[PDB]
C-alpha cells in the first residue's frame, strides 16, 4: 500500500471463480459470541402464549 | 401361531427374571430390587 | 413375548424347515431398519414426561371429564391415568424394538377390556389419548420412525376398540 | 340440541392480577465464587 | 371419617372395637352438632377466603404469575384459583367427617404425580393454603379456629 | 462509555503502565462528584413523571403544528403522543444515567451516536427535543453544584442535537 | 460477480463450444427487455429511502420488542445500524436486478450475513420479515404506471420477487 | 465403566463373560482414544458451554429469574453456575467410562428429594439440560453428535 | 464395587477438579494393557471347568483330610470345596478384567473370614488350594498375564488369613 | 469494560426503569468505601515488582521442573516471558479492583489466555498456583498496618481474593 494507498482486501476472488472469499466485514463482525453472551441479549424469538 | 405361543407353558414362566440381594452395599442395584418388591407385593407401581 | 428375530425363527422352527429365502428377507429387513429403531428408542425416554403431557393437553384436559362427575376428578386417579398413559408409551417402544405386536397381546391386552368396564372408565377417551400420542411421537423422533411406531399404536386402538 | 352449555371453573375475575415488572438478567456471574 | 379409620384399624386386628376407640366417637358425635356449627360458615363465606387467598399468595410468591410460570395471564389465575377452590371444600369435608381421611382419597393421595407432570410447584400451592389459613381463622372464633386451623395444617404438611 | 474511572484505566492501559497518583486524583474527584450526584439522581427520579408531562406540554405549546397536521411523524394522533412522551422519558432516563455514571458516556452510547441519522430518516426535527431539554433544565428544581452539572449534561445533549 | 451475458459466456466455455442459437435468441429478447428490466429498476431506485423507512416503520409497529429496552434494535446506535443493514440489502437487490443476475447479491451479502446475525445475536426472523415487507412494497411501488407508457412487467415482477425471496431466505 | 456393569449383569446369572459381550469390551478399548478427545473438548470449552446455555434456560423459562423465586439475583443464578457445572462435569465422566454409572453414582436417584428440599422444579432444570444438548452438539462433529449425545438422553430422562 | 476406571474417575471427583493429563494417563495405563487382559479372560472362561481339577490334584487329591475321618469327606462337602474354587476363580477374573480388589471386598470377602470358623472347616488347606492354582493358571494364560493375576489371588488368601 | 456505576446503569437500563433507592444507598456506601477500596489498591500497587519476584521465586522453588532443561520456563527468553505474563495478570487484577468490577479482568485476560496456554504447551497448573500464591502474598501485603489509619479492610479482602481466584480459575 505504501504511504498513499487505502488498504483493501487483497486477492479475495480468483479470476476463474464467480465466488471468492467472504468479505472481512462479514467474517469478523464487531464482536463474537463471547461478548454477545455478556450483553444478556434476548433471543429465541419471544416469550409465547397463555393457553 | 396356534402352535407357537399356544403351547402350554405361556412363555413368560422361563423368561421373566428374578431379583436377588447379594449387593447390599451397592446402591443402584438396591433400588431396582425395592421397586421389584413394590411391583410384586402391590404389583402396580406404588407411586400414585 | 416375541421378537421379529424370534417370531420368524420360531415359525420356521414349528414348520420343521430351515432359514428359507422368503424367511431370510424378513431378518435382513429387520437388520436394515434396526439402526433407525435404536436412535428412536432413546428419544422417547428422554421425553417420556412430555409426550404424556402434550397428550393430555391436546385430548384430555379442560373438559367435562376432569370436572366433578367425570372419572378424572379424583386426584388418586389423575395420578393413575398419567401412570396408565405411561404404560402405552413404554410398551409401544417395546413393540417398536421388537418390531412385533406380540408383547402387546400378552402383557397389555391380556384382560384389558374387562378391567376397564369393571371400573367404568371411558373407552374412547383413552383411545383419543392414543391418537394424541401418535402425532406427538412422530414429530419428536422424525416421521420415518413415527410411521412405524404408530403401527403398534393402531394395534392398541384395535384391541381397545 | 347440540347439547348447549352452562358452568364450572368460571374463574374470570382477575381481581388483583398484579402487573408485571418484566425484568431480565445479565449472566456475567461469578462462576468461580458462590458461597463458602 | 373418624369411624372409617377405626373400622380398618379394627379389621387389621380382626377384633371388635376397643373402648379406647369408642369414646373418640362419643367425643365426636356430641361435638358433631358443634362441628357442623363450624364449617357451614366456611361454606357460607365462600368467596371471602378465595379472593383473599390469591392476593395473599401473590405477594408472598410473585414468580408464579410471571412469564415462564405455570399460572400466567388470564385463565391461568382462575384455574389456580379453582384448584384452590377445590382444596377449600376438603377442609370443610374433613371437619364434618371429623377426620382427614376423606381429604386423602379424593384430594391428597395422588398429588405428587399430577403436579410433577403439570409443572405446578407443590410448595407454591402449599403457601396458598398457608395464605388462606389466616383469613379463615379470623372468620371463626379462636377456640373454634384452633381445631380447624390444624385441618389446614395437615394439608400444609401433606403438600410440603 | 466515557466515564472517568474507565477512561483512567484506558489511559493506563494504552500507556502500558501501572496506575499512578493521577488516577487517584481522578478518583477522589469522582467520589466528590458522586457524593452529591447520586442524591440528585434520586431527586430527578422522584420528579420524573411530572417533568416528562411538562416537557411534552411545552413542546406542544411551542410547536402547535405537530398536534394539528396529519402525519405519522407528528403527534396528532394518540400513538404519536405515547411514543413521543416515551422518548421524552428516554431523554430524562439517559440524563439520570449520566448523573449516576459520572460522565456523558451513557447518553453518548444510548442516544447521541445515531440520533442524527434517525432524525434524518424519520422527519423528526431535533428542535423539539431541544425545547424539551430546555424545559427540563429550567424545571428540574435542583440547586447548587448538582444543578449546575445537571444543566451541563442537558446542555451537552442540546449541543449534540444541534 | 456475473452478468446475464457473462453467465451465458461461462456456461458456453464450460461446455467448450460456441454459443448455441437459442441462447442467442434468448439473449436478444433479454436485450430487448433489458431496458424494460431497467424502468422498474429506476423507479425502484428513486424511492429507496421511503421504502426503507416505511419498511422499518411497519416492522417496528409489528414487533415492538425490538424498540423495547433490551431489544436488539433498541439503542439509537443499534437502530441506525439496523436501518443501515436494511438499506444495504435493498441496494444490493437493486444491483442484482441491474445486472440481471443473483450472483452479485449472493457475493455481496448472503454467505456471510447469516453467520453475522447469528454471532451478533441479531434475530434473523425480524430482518427476514422486514426484507419481505420491503420487497412487497418495492414491487407495489414498481408496478404502478404513473406517467409511464403501457408495457408488460410480468416476468420482472417474477425476477424482483425472486431476488427478494432469495435475500429473505439467505438471511433466515 | 462398561466393564463393571457387564460384570454385574454376568454376576446375577452366575456366569462368565460371554464372547458376544467380550467383543463389546474389546471394541471399547480400541475406541477409547476416540472418546477421550471429545471429552477433552468438553473439558476445554466447559466455560462457554454453560454461560450461553444458561441464558437459553432463562429465555425459555424466565420464571426462575423472577423475584420471589428459587434462584434469583446475581448470587443465586451464580449457584446455577455452581450446580450445572457438575452436570457438565459428569457427562464427560459418562463418556470416558462408556456408560452411565458415573451419572448413576452421583446425580440421579436423590434428585427428587434434593430439588424438593431446594424448592426448584426439576423440569425447569431439565429444559436447561435439553437446551444444553442442542448447544453441545454445535461443538461436536456429525459422527460424535449421536454417541456423546447418547449419554445426554439418559440425563434428560432421569430428570423427567 | 469400584472399577479401576471408576476409581481414577473417583479420585478426581472427590477433589472435583476435572480430569487432567495425569488423570487421563491412568485410563491410558488401563487401555494400553487392555487388549491382553480381555484375551486372558477367554482362556480362563473355556478352561474353568478343566483347570479346577488340577488345583486339587496338585494339592488335596490324596491328603490327610480327604480320606475317611476328615473334612472334604461327604461328597456333599467335596462339592463345596470345588464350588468355592469355582467361586474364587470366577470372581478373580472379574477382578482381573476390572483391575481392582474392591469387587473382591464386596462380593467374595465381605464376611468370608467369620463363617469359616463356625462351620468347622479347614481354612489353611483352602489357602494352599488357591496357591496351587497359580502355577496351573499361569501355564495356559502365558507368562505376562500370569503375574497380574497373582496379586488378585494374593488378596484373597491374605484376606482369608 | 464496566464500572460499578456503569454496571448499575446497564442493569437499570435493561430493567428499563430508573434506579431504585436501595441501589442508590448501596452506591452511596460504595462511594464511601471506594477510597477505602483503593488505598488498599495503592499499597497493593507500590509493591508489585516485589510481589511478582517473590511469587516466581517461590514457584520456581516449588516446581524445579520449570527451571530444569526442557522445562517450559527454562529458557532465559521464556523465563522473561513468564515474569511478563505474571506481571500482566497482577496489573489487570489491580485494574479490576480499581474499577470495582471483574469485567475488565475478564475482558483483558481470561477468555483467551486459557486457550493460549493450551496452544503454547504452557502448563496451566503452575501459573494457576503462581497466581494463587501471588494473590495470597498480595492480601498479606495489603492487610498489614504501617502508619495508616484504621479501616474496614476486611470485605475488600473478600473482593481482592475473589478477583485472584477468578483469575486462577480462568487460567486453570
Ligand atoms: C385414564 C387414562 C382413564 C381413566 C382411568 C382410571 N384408571 C384407573 C386405572 C386402572 N388402570 C389399570 C391399568 C393397567 N394396569 C396394568 O398393569 C396395565 C398394563 C401394564 C394397565 C393398562 C388398572 C389395573 C386400574 C385399577 C386398579 C387400581 O385401583 O389401582 C382408575 C382406578 C380405579 C379406582 O377405583 O381408583 C380411574 C379413573 N379414567 C379416565 O378419566 C381416563 C379415560
Ligand atoms: C434490522 C433489519 C435488523 C437488525 C440489524 C442490525 N445489524 C446490526 C449490525 C451489523 N450488521 C452487519 C451486516 C452487514 N454488514 C455488511 O457489510 C453487509 C453486506 C455488505 C451486511 C448485510 C454487520 C457486519 C454488523 C456489525 C458491525 C456493525 O456496525 O454494524 C445491528 C447492530 C448490532 C450492534 O451491536 O451494533 C443491528 C441492530 N437487527 C435487528 O434487530 C433487526 C432484526
Ligand atoms: C414497468 C413496471 C412498467 C412499464 C415500463 C416500460 N418502459 C418501456 C420503455 C422505455 N422506458 C424507458 C425509460 C427510460 N429510458 C431512459 O433512458 C431513462 C433514463 C434512465 C428512462 C427512465 C424508455 C426510454 C423506454 C424505451 C425507449 C423510449 O421510450 O423512448 C416499456 C415498453 C418499451 C420497452 O420495452 O422498453 C415499458 C412497458 N410499462 C408498464 O406498463 C409497467 C407498469
Ligand atoms: C380436589 C382434588 C383435586 C386437585 C388437587 C386438582 C388439581 C388440578 N389442577 C389443575 C390445573 C391447574 N392448576 C393450576 C394451579 C396452579 N398453578 C400455579 O402456578 C399455582 C402454583 C397453582 C395453584 C395456586 C394451573 C395453572 C392449571 C392449568 C394447567 C395448565 O393450563 O397448563 C387440573 C386440570 C384442570 C382442572 O380440571 O382443573 C387439575 C385436575 N383437581 C382436583 O379435583
Ligand atoms: C433511549 C434513546 C432513544 C431515543 C431518543 C429514541 C427515539 C426514536 N423515536 C422514534 C419515533 C418517534 N419519535 C417521536 C417523537 C416526537 N414527535 C413529535 O411530534 C413530538 C414533538 C416528539 C415527542 C417527544 C414520535 C411521535 C415517533 C413515532 C414516529 C415514527 O413512526 O417513527 C424512533 C423510531 C422507532 C419507531 O418508529 O417507533 C426512535 C428510534 N429511541 C431511543 O431508543
Ligand atoms: C462367592 C464367595 C463365596 C464362597 C467361596 C462361599 C462358600 C460357602 N462354602 C460353604 C461351605 C464349605 N466350604 C468348604 C471349604 C473348603 N473346603 C476345605 O476343606 C477348605 C478349608 C476350603 C477350600 C475350598 C467346605 C468343606 C464346606 C462345606 C462345610 C459344611 O457344609 O459343613 C457354604 C455353606 C454351604 C454351601 O452353600 O455350600 C458357603 C455359602 N460362599 C460365598 O458367598
Ligand atoms: C493516590 C494518592 C492518595 C492516597 C494514597 C490516599 C489515601 C487515603 N486513604 C484515606 C483513608 C483511609 N484509608 C484506609 C485504609 C486502610 N485502613 C486500614 O486499617 C486497612 C488495613 C487499610 C485498607 C486495607 C482507611 C481505613 C481510611 C479511612 C478514611 C476513608 O475511609 O477514606 C484517605 C482519606 C483522606 C485523608 O486521609 O486525608 C486518603 C487521603 N488519598 C490520595 O489521594
Secondary-structure element sequence of chain C? HHHHHHHHH
- Total helices of chain F: the number is 8
Sheet of most strands of chain C: none
Structural class of chain C: mainly alpha
C-alpha Rg of chain C, in Å? Answer: 18 Å
Strand content of chain F: under 5%
| Global geometry of chain C | globular
Largest sheet of chain F: none
Number of strands of chain C: 0
- Largest interface, counted by CB within 8 Å of the partner chain's CB: F-J, 32 and 30 residues
Helix content of chain F: over 70%
Apparent shape of chain F:
elongated
Strand composition percent of chain C: under 5%
**Percentage of helical residues of chain C?**
over 70%
Strand and helix layout:
This is part of a larger assembly, with two copies of chain A, one copy of chain B (48 residues), two copies of chain C (161 residues), two copies of chain E (160 residues), one copy of chain F (162 residues) and two copies of chain G (172 residues).
Chain A: H1 24-27, H2 33-38
Chain B: H1 28-41
Chain E: H1 2-13, H2 19-30, H3 32-44, H4 47-58, H5 79-97, H6 101-108, H7 111-118, H8 122-139, H9 142-159
Bound molecules: phycocyanobilin (CYC) (7 copies).
The site of one phycocyanobilin (CYC) has 18 residues of chain C, from helix 5, helix 7 and helix 8.
Subcellular location (chains G, J): Cellular thylakoid membrane
Family (chains G, J): Belongs to the phycobiliprotein family.
Protein name (chains G, J): Phycocyanin beta subunit
Question: Can you give a write-up of this model?
Answer:
- The structure is cut from a larger assembly and holds two copies of chain A, one copy of chain B (48 residues), two copies of chain C (161 residues), two copies of chain E (160 residues), one copy of chain F (162 residues) and two copies of chain G (172 residues).
- With 48 residues, chain B is mainly alpha-helical.
- Helix content of chain B is 29%, strand content 0%.
- Chain B has one helix and no strands.
- Chain E has helices spanning 2-13, 19-30, 32-44, 47-58, 79-97, 101-108, 111-118, 122-139, 142-159.
- One phycocyanobilin sits between chains G (66, 72-73, 78, 81-82, 85-86, 88, 108-109, 113, 116, 120, 122-123, 126-127, 130) and A (25-26, 29-30).
Give a short overview.
This is part of a larger assembly, with two copies of chain A, one copy of chain B (48 residues), two copies of chain C (161 residues), two copies of chain E (160 residues), one copy of chain F (162 residues) and two copies of chain G (172 residues). Chain B has 48 residues and is mostly helical. Chain B has one helix at residues 28-41.
Amino acid at each position: 500500500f505504501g504511504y498513499d494507498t487505502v488498504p483493501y482486501q487483497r486477492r479475495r476472488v480468483l479470476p476463474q471463480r464467480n465466488v471468492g472469499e467472504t468479505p472481512f466485514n462479514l467474517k469478523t463482525p464487531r464482536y463474537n459470541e463471547y461478548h454477545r453472551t455478556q450483553l444478556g441479549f434476548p433471543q429465541v424469538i419471544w416469550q409465547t402464549s397463555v393457553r | 401361531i396356534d402352535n407357537q405361543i399356544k403351547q402350554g407353558v405361556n412363555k413368560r414362566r422361563e423368561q421373566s427374571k428374578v431379583f436377588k440381594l447379594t449387593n447390599v452395599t451397592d446402591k443402584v442395584a438396591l433400588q431396582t430390587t425395592i421397586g421389584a418388591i413394590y411391583r410384586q407385593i402391590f404389583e402396580r407401581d406404588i407411586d400414585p | 413375548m416375541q421378537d421379529a428375530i424370534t417370531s420368524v425363527i420360531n415359525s420356521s422352527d414349528v414348520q420343521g424347515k430351515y432359514l428359507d429365502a422368503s424367511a431370510i428377507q424378513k431378518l435382513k429387513a429387520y437388520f436394515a431398519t434396526g439402526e433407525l429403531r435404536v436412535r428412536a428408542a432413546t428419544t422417547i425416554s428422554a421425553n417420556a414426561a412430555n409426550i404424556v403431557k402434550e397428550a393430555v393437553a391436546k385430548s384430555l384436559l379442560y373438559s367435562d371429564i376432569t370436572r366433578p362427575g367425570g372419572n378424572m376428578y379424583t386426584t388418586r386417579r389423575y395420578a393413575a391415568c398419567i401412570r396408565d398413559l405411561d404404560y402405552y408409551l413404554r410398551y409401544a417402544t417395546y413393540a417398536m424394538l421388537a418390531g412385533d405386536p406380540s408383547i402387546l397381546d400378552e402383557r397389555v391386552l391380556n384382560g384389558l377390556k374387562e378391567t376397564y368396564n369393571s371400573l367404568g372408565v371411558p373407552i374412547g377417551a383413552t383411545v383419543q389419548a392414543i391418537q394424541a400420542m401418535k402425532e406427538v411421537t412422530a414429530g419428536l423422533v422424525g416421521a420415518d420412525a413415527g410411521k412405524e411406531m404408530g403401527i403398534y399404536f393402531d394395534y392398541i386402538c384395535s384391541g381397545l376398540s | 340440541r347440540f347439547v348447549p352449555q352452562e358452568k364450572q371453573p368460571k374463574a374470570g375475575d382477575p381481581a388483583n392480577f398484579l402487573a408485571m415488572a418484566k425484568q431480565v438478567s445479565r449472566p456475567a456471574n461469578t462462576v468461580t465464587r458462590v458461597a463458602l | 371419617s373418624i369411624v372409617t379409620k377405626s373400622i380398618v384399624n379394627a379389621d387389621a386386628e380382626a377384633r371388635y372395637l376397643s373402648p379406647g376407640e369408642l369414646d373418640r366417637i362419643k367425643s365426636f358425635v356430641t361435638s358433631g352438632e358443634r362441628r357442623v356449627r363450624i364449617a357451614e360458615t366456611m361454606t357460607g363465606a365462600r368467596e371471602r377466603i378465595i379472593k383473599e387467598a390469591g392476593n395473599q399468595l401473590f405477594q408472598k410468591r410473585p414468580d408464579v404469575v410471571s412469564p415462564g410460570g405455570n399460572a400466567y395471564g388470564e385463565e391461568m389465575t382462575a384455574t389456580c384459583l379453582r384448584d384452590l377452590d377445590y382444596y377449600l371444600r376438603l377442609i370443610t369435608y374433613g371437619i364434618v367427617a371429623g377426620d382427614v381421611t376423606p381429604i386423602e382419597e379424593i384430594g391428597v393421595v395422588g398429588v405428587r404425580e399430577m403436579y410433577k407432570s403439570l409443572g405446578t410447584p407443590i410448595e407454591a400451592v402449599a403457601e396458598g393454603v398457608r395464605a388462606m389459613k389466616s383469613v379463615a381463622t379470623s372468620l371463626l372464633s379462636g377456640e373454634d379456629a384452633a381445631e380447624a386451623g390444624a385441618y389446614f395444617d395437615y394439608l400444609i404438611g401433606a403438600m410440603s | 462509555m466515557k466515564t472517568p474511572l474507565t477512561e483512567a484505566v484506558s489511559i493506563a492501559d494504552s500507556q502500558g503502565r501501572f496506575l499512578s497518583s493521577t488516577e487517584i486524583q481522578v478518583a477522589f474527584g469522582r467520589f466528590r462528584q458522586a457524593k452529591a450526584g447520586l442524591e440528585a439522581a434520586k431527586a430527578l427520579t422522584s420528579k420524573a413523571d411530572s417533568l416528562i408531562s411538562g416537557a411534552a406540554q411545552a413542546v406542544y405549546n411551542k410547536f402547535p403544528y405537530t398536534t394539528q397536521m396529519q402525519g405519522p411523524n407528528y403527534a396528532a394522533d394518540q400513538r404519536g403522543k405515547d411514543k413521543c412522551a416515551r422518548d421524552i422519558g428516554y431523554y430524562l432516563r439517559m440524563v439520570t444515567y449520566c448523573l449516576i455514571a459520572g460522565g456523558t458516556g451513557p447518553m453518548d452510547e444510548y442516544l447521541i451516536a445515531g440520533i442524527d441519522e434517525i432524525n434524518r430518516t424519520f422527519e423528526l426535527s431535533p428542535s423539539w427535543y431541544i425545547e424539551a431539554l430546555k424545559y427540563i433544565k429550567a424545571n428540574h428544581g435542583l440547586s447548587g453544584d448538582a444543578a449546575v452539572e445537571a444543566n451541563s449534561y442537558l446542555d451537552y445533549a442540546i449541543n449534540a442535537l444541534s | 460477480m456475473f452478468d446475464a451475458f457473462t453467465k451465458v459466456v461461462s456456461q458456453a466455455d464450460t461446455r467448450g463450444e460456441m454459443l448455441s442459437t437459442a441462447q442467442i435468441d434468448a439473449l436478444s429478447q433479454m436485450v430487448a427487455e433489458s431496458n424494460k428490466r431497467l424502468d422498474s429498476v429506476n423507479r425502484i431506485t428513486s424511492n429507496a429511502s421511503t421504502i426503507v423507512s416505511n419498511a422499518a416503520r411497519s416492522l417496528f409497529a409489528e414487533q415492538p420488542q425490538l424498540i423495547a429496552p433490551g431489544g436488539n434494535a433498541y439503542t439509537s446506535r443499534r437502530m441506525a445500524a439496523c436501518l443501515r443493514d436494511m438499506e444495504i440489502i435493498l441496494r444490493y437487490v437493486t444491483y442484482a436486478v441491474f445486472a440481471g443476475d443473483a450472483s452479485v447479491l449472493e457475493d455481496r451479502c448472503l454467505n456471510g450475513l447469516r453467520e453475522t446475525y447469528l454471532a451478533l445475536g441479531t434475530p434473523g426472523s425480524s430482518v427476514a420479515v422486514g426484507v419481505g415487507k420491503m420487497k412487497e412494497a418495492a414491487l407495489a411501488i414498481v408496478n404502478d404506471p404513473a406517467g409511464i407508457t403501457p408495457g408488460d412487467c410480468s416476468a420482472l415482477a417474477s425476477e424482483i420477487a425472486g431476488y427478494f425471496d432469495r435475500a429473505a431466505a439467505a438471511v433466515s
